[PDB]
Amino acid sequence: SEMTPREIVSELDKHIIGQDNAKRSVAIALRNRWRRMQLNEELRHEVTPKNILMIGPTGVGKTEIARRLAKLANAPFIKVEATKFTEVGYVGKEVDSIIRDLTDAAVKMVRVQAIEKNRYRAEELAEERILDVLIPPAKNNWGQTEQQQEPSAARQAFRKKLREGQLDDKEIEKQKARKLKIKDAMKLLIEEEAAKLVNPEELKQDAIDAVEQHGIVFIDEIDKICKRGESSGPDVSREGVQRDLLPLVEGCTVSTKHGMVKTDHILFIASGAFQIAKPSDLIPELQGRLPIRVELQALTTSDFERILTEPNASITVQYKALMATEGVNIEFTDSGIKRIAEAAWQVNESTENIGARRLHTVLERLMEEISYDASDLSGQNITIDADYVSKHLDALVADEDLSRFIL
Amino acid sequence: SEMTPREIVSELDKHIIGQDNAKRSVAIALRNRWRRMQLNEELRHEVTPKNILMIGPTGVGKTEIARRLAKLANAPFIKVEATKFTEVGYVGKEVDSIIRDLTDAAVKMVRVQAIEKNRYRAEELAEERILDVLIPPAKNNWGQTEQQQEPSAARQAFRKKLREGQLDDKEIEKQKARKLKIKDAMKLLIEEEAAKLVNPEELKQDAIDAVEQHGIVFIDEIDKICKRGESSGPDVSREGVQRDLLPLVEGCTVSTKHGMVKTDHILFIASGAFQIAKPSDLIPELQGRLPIRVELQALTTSDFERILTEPNASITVQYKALMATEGVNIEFTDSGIKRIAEAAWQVNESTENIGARRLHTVLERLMEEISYDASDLSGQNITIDADYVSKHLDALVADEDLSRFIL
Numbered sequence A, B: 001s002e003m004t005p006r007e008i009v010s011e012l013d014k015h016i017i018g019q020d021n022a023k024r025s026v027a028i029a030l031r032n033r034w035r036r037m038q039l040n041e042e043l044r045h046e047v048t049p050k051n052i053l054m055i056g057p058t059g060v061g062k063t064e065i066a067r068r069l070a071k072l073a074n075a076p077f078i079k080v081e082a083t084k085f086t087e088v089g090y091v092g093k094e095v096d097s098i099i100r101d102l103t104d105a106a107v108k109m110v111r112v113q114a115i116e117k118n119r120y121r122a123e124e125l126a127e128e129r130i131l132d133v134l135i136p137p138a139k140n141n142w143g144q145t146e147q148q149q150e151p152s153a154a155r156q157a158f159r160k161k162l163r164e165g166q167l168d169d170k171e172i173e174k175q176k177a178r179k180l181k182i183k184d185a186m187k188l189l190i191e192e193e194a195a196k197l198v199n200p201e202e203l204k205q206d207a208i209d210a211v212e213q214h215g216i217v218f219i220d221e222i223d224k225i226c227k228r229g230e231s232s233g234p235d236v237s238r239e240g241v242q243r244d245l246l247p248l249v250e251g252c253t254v255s256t257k258h259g260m261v262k263t264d265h266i267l268f269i270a271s272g273a274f275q276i277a278k279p280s281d282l283i284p285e286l287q288g289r290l291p292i293r294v295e296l297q298a299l300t301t302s303d304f305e306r307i308l309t310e311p312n313a314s315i316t317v318q319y320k321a322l323m324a325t326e327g328v329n330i331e332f333t334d335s336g337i338k339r340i341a342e343a344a345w346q347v348n349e350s351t352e353n354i355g356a357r358r359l360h361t362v363l364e365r366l367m368e369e370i371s372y373d374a375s376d377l378s379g380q381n382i383t384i385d386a387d388y389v390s391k392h393l394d395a396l397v398a399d400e401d402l403s404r405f406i407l
């Protein structure tokens, strides 16, 4: 029982922005996963996980979308740059890494949780182990097969004096540099028991599945690998990358550190805005394994204003907070934010679209002085208004052959 | 006994449209494999498997034909693009890798095929101890055999009570003695007391019997590695591969982490469309090692149509069930189907004739909304009629660009 296509989207809508379709498509993909494994043996393992090919500029969300999705969808993710496989050093054995990498990034995942579940027998057996101290009851147990509920009582009223009143430094009822104490034992006896419920197999075999079955790969700049003109050079080695991918894509088995895997039931997400080339130029074989094609729209002034603030920890936020530490306090007005955004955009349009990123520069650049002369004006309060903004930037933005340096 | 020529074919056109000849070829080969078993020892290990070279455009079948056959025959198979062996290929000098890989899967196969071939006990024997911890059998039993079917009074009750209701916190028996939950323990013991019957030795030695005997390879893109001349630069590099491959086809042995395998009798299937080169152009020794040459022709719309239906588990067929999963029946009209096919075809006749591959796209994009707006439809009913396809696709198929982007 997973989230409905729209249900998924909503979750994405939380920490993200536009790219709706994108969210939609990615969502769908997630959904199908369920439908897939919910039929008959024949197709059960005969339906190829539809792979998305994100077609948009500057990892403006796409990167995140994929990230977020796989996260909430709870599954092994992995960002891999296409080009990262072109040229000597690491080629064929490096293309297969993708999996390997992920697989590991998975085995680590399956661990950070395989312990969260057994996070009981740790502190419970960590306290009870050091609970067998102070004043013992008797030494007559296992004598009855139906009567055992009274003799053994060293903690039937001492378990509370080990919760808040643990302390101590006892031991029981060449290398040494650590002292054992119920105060630290209540916390250290955990590392011990937490290492008793860890079966490398129940983790290995667990991850391997939660990978070759729920894998999400994000191939960035896939468009790069495509082609150029007629006298292609490192491209005859580029296409190779593509080819070298097919296997994992088309579905296959690769040798890992914790065994072997199956890249068939895996989900991949190509990416990159195609300017020089197009999905069409892409290698048919692969171009065919990359179904769901989604067009990612640019970013609007509005969008910015949002990312400029909305985020749980906006860039404007932490900044005011940073200025705060300096005793100085700033005021990010809705009047200026618009201008802030109003700027970022202008630049992106004038120079070259990038989105989000543009901000860091435009903001930091506008907040120049303030950042510099802080204690030089500590205490008082400053207003970041639409006029204050333009007052600074205004010029720059206009001067194209320059903005390409400070922004 | 194995299927006669057409006997194979029949089971072959089960997922492939036309191109029978190739099937025949692929079929015959399969048959020969057995004929050899009849040809008395004298000519036993004195007979080549006779390998085939498939020659045809893109997305026309080849591949499938292979697998389908490989599957229909139950034998470790593996596709492989030569290309990943040329141009500064330090690994391209590892053409033997092939078997090393065909053996890897060869491993998986028999293995996984062993888990199912031995799972009737895998589960049973598991829950046993479970129930055994549930109703601890009495000590010292008086041999009567039927006296074990008696505890079933409560036992069976419990057993039946377990094949549904569980999640009880127990503890059972480098063995065990851990206190978890019957849920996990059921699958832990299901495995612990599962791998009891495997025999890694005879197992790993069972797999080789496949790769060595029942094994198939699909040397892909052979056409690439061929010729041109006038300054023999990358030429004496490509051809090389061919030679490097010979031994495998010819018949040699390769070192694998699993042992030694004899490519003597193995089905290698070279292929690719020689729009530029020609089989003749290919190195002779090989040209001669590829005795069976068959041609594949481009699929026509009619074929497409057929492809969207007749084939067992056709896209639509899948999509039908796939949609039905979200509790909603769809219906493609003989007219709509035509459209899809037509659509698909049209695109190929303006951008790139990627053949059959085209469909997957077309359709999937045709079912955009539906695939998304699913949960809500639940119980609803919709027919993908001509006027439907034509509504979504027509628009696209009309203009280029897009198609080259999302098709």
Ligand SMILES: Nc1ncnc2c1ncn2[C@@H]1O[C@H](COP(=O)(O)OP(=O)(O)NP(=O)(O)O)[C@@H](O)[C@H]1O
Pocket (backbone or CB within 6 Å): A284, A285, B015, B016, B017, B018, B056, B057, B058, B059, B060, B061, B062, B063, B064, B065, B299, B307, B311, B356, B357
């Ligand atoms: N009879 C068929 N002819 C063509 N394609 C088919 C057929 N039946 C199913 N298909 C689908 O269409 C695809 C055709 O691609 P493939 O099987 O690689 O053919 P191919 O001729 O080997 N391709 P290529 O190497 O690109 O020329 C398959 O992956 C199937 O999903």
